[PDB]
Amino acid sequence: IKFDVDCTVDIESLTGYRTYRCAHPLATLFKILASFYISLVIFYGLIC
Amino acid sequence: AFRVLKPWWDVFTDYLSVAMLMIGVFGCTLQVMQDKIICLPKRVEMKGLKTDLDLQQYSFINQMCYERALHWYAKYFPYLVLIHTLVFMLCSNFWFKFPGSSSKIEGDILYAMYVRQTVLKVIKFLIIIAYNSALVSKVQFTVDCNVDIQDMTGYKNFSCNHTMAHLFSKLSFCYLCFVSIYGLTCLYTLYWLFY
Amino acid sequence: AFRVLKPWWDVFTDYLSVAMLMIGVFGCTLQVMQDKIICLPKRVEMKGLKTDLDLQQYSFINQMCYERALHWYAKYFPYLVLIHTLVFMLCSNFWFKFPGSSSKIEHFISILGKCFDSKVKKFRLHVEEGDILYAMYVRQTVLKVIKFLIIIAYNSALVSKVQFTVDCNVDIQDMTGYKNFSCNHTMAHLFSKLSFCYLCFVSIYGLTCLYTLYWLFYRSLREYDVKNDFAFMLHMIDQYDPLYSKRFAVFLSE
Amino acid sequence: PAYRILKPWWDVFTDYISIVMLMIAVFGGTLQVTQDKMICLPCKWVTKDSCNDSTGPTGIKYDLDRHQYNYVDAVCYENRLHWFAKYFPYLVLLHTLIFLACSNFWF
Amino acid sequence: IKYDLDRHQYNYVDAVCYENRLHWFAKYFPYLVLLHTLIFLACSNFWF
């Protein structure tokens, strides 16, 4: 989960460029939720 | 075992926690739907000031400045409020939920848990205030970001405005008030355990 | 302990409060979703008037002018109504959310039901030692009158503040190239009529409170024999139903 | 029901934990449904399939209409975004559903 | 590259290509699933 990715999707015949840099606006929030979920899973596993 | 055992202050704290939860849910909904930052490049009868930026470039600038510049308290305020209010409700109802205490209420372990719950709530009030008071002023309706997006947008300095901040300024402040009253109805409880 | 305790004016106040809360929630929803300000630069067969402004620049101007120029009352009328209605409802229901009155009224309803079926000696000892409940009700009604007066008096002036058209002179130059902007608040003309209906509801609420003032300050309900608390709690059920007083007065008689 | 006596304390704690996990799965799922996009800009100067990144400033012109930006966003989001970034809430929801199924299977 | 197509032309071509050359099992999968589950439920609870 990264905020920015680089894709070489390789479609020049449609757009005309080689590689693109893209921002994933929800990446930070998804990382926060992933950490929260793994903490909850750790508690669940300890109890189990 | 749910209605007559609640004293006046417990019910009033429950009402305040419900109000705080409602405010947190409203803030989270606003953050989900109508939370965005509008940016412009800083340094380019009267005519316009065209900067020849396509819409996708403006969106990229908005997201870069939003993720990098804005302080995390402004971004993640409603989730913090929701977590704190949920923890308060959980620790208030824990005196009923716990099976060891639920069986007895329905040894002196029953009272130590209440003392610990009151201590935890007081500590929560103190630690909530510790950063809420010092970070409420952090939010600003305007902001200035210098982000390394040149050679992608051609600019380096941007003036942005965070639309929700104003309402958040009217929200967190009011939320802080609902903390203080709650704190009283918390501290009073602790006093009844010691006075 | 639910139906017999509500005089008709109390039910009218409850219904008006419900309607006001509905209006407040509707206004809050409209503010959240469809509240926005449309802005244009003031001054640059007919043609266009191209100001060569990007969409992002237009949106920036919109947000700046909306946050700055638009009046605070226009921005916070729904939440204002929400808070006032919540305070009214909380004040009205606090008389029964309070545990002490919950202990008093529960016993009063038990003894009233027992007296209807066909403790009173202990009742006239433990209950007649009050009179603070009559004072509490009087103070709550006075507080409601205060709120109604303050609301109407200060709202009748600021209601005219909301306007469809609006003007903003904001230092957006060197970012957009203009300084003066003409804008419109799309839902302002709807907010005007919404606030007018809210004012009418509050006025009827205040008139109901004024009639409750007549009921509370015309015949000195402190005495009726019974003490002030028992006389007040008898007058309440008498207002709810004139008959139950006759069936309650029996057990007092020796 | 009166089965509340058959649940030890840890079972109640796991029920609450599963409820919280389900709540965050629903939240992360609606967020992923209604807003999850990629915002792509092409890089003009490329060095080894990577962005080199090297009298006021004037904006760069890529000469791409909006629909081409949408298409490149869709393609990049489909291909060069790791599945765990996209399908995190659905995996959380599936794991919580099977945890709840395990918890209440004997009932 | 440039195609000199306004936004509405893109929307129209999207609509046409979506109606014509997208396999129906992609468009109408959820409706088929809903129908099959409804008839499964009606089979399970017909006698009751």
From Swiss-Prot, chain A:
Extracellular side: 1-28
Transmembrane feature ranges: 29-48
Post-translational modifications reported in the UniProt record: N-glycosylated.
Tissues of expression: Ubiquitously expressed. High levels detected in the bone marrow; lower levels found in peripheral blood cells. Highly expressed in pancreatic beta cells.
Superkingdom as given in the UniProt entry: Eukaryota
Summary of the knockout phenotype: Increased prenatal and postnatal mortality, growth retardation, and multiple tissue abnormalities. B-cell development is slightly impaired, without affecting B-cell function. Mice however show a cell-autonomous early block in thymocyte development and impairs peripheral T-cell expansion and function. Conditional deletion in germ cells leads to abnormal sperm and male infertility: the cytoplasm of late spermatids appears swollen, preventing reduction of the cytoplasm during further development into spermatozoa.
Localization, UniProt: Cell membrane; Lysosome membrane
Protein family (similarity comment): Belongs to the LRRC8 family.
Associated disease: Defects in Lrrc8a are the cause of ebouriffe (ebo), a spontaneous mutation that causes male sterility. Spermatozoa present in the epididymis display severe malformations, mostly of the tail. A drastic decrease of the spermatid population is observed, whereas spermatogonia and spermatocytes seem moderately affected. Defects are caused by decreased volume-regulated anion channel (VRAC) activity in germ cells. Oogenesis is not affected but embryos derived from ebo/ebo females show early developmental failure.
Domain writeup: The volume-regulated anion channel (VRAC) channel forms a trimer of dimers, with symmetry mismatch between the pore-forming domain and the cytosolic LRR repeats, a topology similar to gap junction proteins. The di-leucine motif is required for lysosomal localization.
Name of the molecule in the record: Volume-regulated anion channel subunit LRRC8A
Organism from which the protein derives: Mus musculus
The gene coding this protein: Lrrc8a
Span of the entire protein shown here: 289 to 336 of 810
UniProtKB/Swiss-Prot annotation, chain B:
Disruption phenotype: Mice do not show remarkable changes in body weight or the weight of white adipose tissue on a chow diet, but display significantly lower body weights and fat mass than wild-type mice when fed a high-fat diet. Moreover, improved insulin resistance induced by the high-fat diet is observed.
Record field: transmembrane: 8-33, 75-94, 115-136, 167-191
Places the protein is found: Cell membrane; Endoplasmic reticulum membrane
Extracellular side: 137-166
Cystine connections: 39-160, 65-145
Induction line: Induced during the earliest stages of adipogenesis.
Expression across tissues: Expressed at very low levels in adipose tissue.
Oligomeric and partner information: Heterohexamer; oligomerizes with other LRRC8 proteins (LRRC8A, LRRC8B, LRRC8D and/or LRRC8E) to form a heterohexamer. Homoheptamer; inactive, likely because it is not targeted to the plasma membrane in the absence of LRRC8A. In vivo, the subunit composition may depend primarily on expression levels, and heterooligomeric channels containing various proportions of the different LRRC8 proteins may coexist.
Entry remark concerning the domains of this protein: The volume-regulated anion channel (VRAC) channel forms a trimer of dimers, with symmetry mismatch between the pore-forming domain and the cytosolic LRR repeats, a topology similar to gap junction proteins.
Family as reported in the entry's similarity comment: Belongs to the LRRC8 family.
Protein name, as recorded: Volume-regulated anion channel subunit LRRC8C
Gene designation per UniProt: Lrrc8c
Swiss-Prot record, chain C:
Transmembrane segments: 8-33, 75-94, 138-159, 190-214
Recorded consequence of changing residue 55 to R: No effect on channel activity of the complex with LRRC8A
Compartments in which it is found: Cell membrane; Endoplasmic reticulum membrane
Knockout-associated phenotype: Mice do not show remarkable changes in body weight or the weight of white adipose tissue on a chow diet, but display significantly lower body weights and fat mass than wild-type mice when fed a high-fat diet. Moreover, improved insulin resistance induced by the high-fat diet is observed.
Induction field: Induced during the earliest stages of adipogenesis.
Disulfide bonds: 39-183, 65-168
Tissue specificity remark: Expressed at very low levels in adipose tissue.
Extracellular topological segments: 160-189
Assigned protein family: Belongs to the LRRC8 family.
Protein purpose: Non-essential component of the volume-regulated anion channel (VRAC, also named VSOAC channel), an anion channel required to maintain a constant cell volume in response to extracellular or intracellular osmotic changes. The VRAC channel conducts iodide better than chloride and can also conduct organic osmolytes like taurine. Plays a redundant role in the efflux of amino acids, such as aspartate and glutamate, in response to osmotic stress.
Subunit structure: Heterohexamer; oligomerizes with other LRRC8 proteins (LRRC8A, LRRC8B, LRRC8D and/or LRRC8E) to form a heterohexamer. Homoheptamer; inactive, likely because it is not targeted to the plasma membrane in the absence of LRRC8A. In vivo, the subunit composition may depend primarily on expression levels, and heterooligomeric channels containing various proportions of the different LRRC8 proteins may coexist.
This protein's name: Volume-regulated anion channel subunit LRRC8C
Organism encoding this protein: Mus musculus
Classification lineage: Eukaryota, Metazoa, Chordata, Craniata, Vertebrata
Gene that encodes it: Lrrc8c
Boundaries of the shown chain within the full protein: 16 to 394 of 803
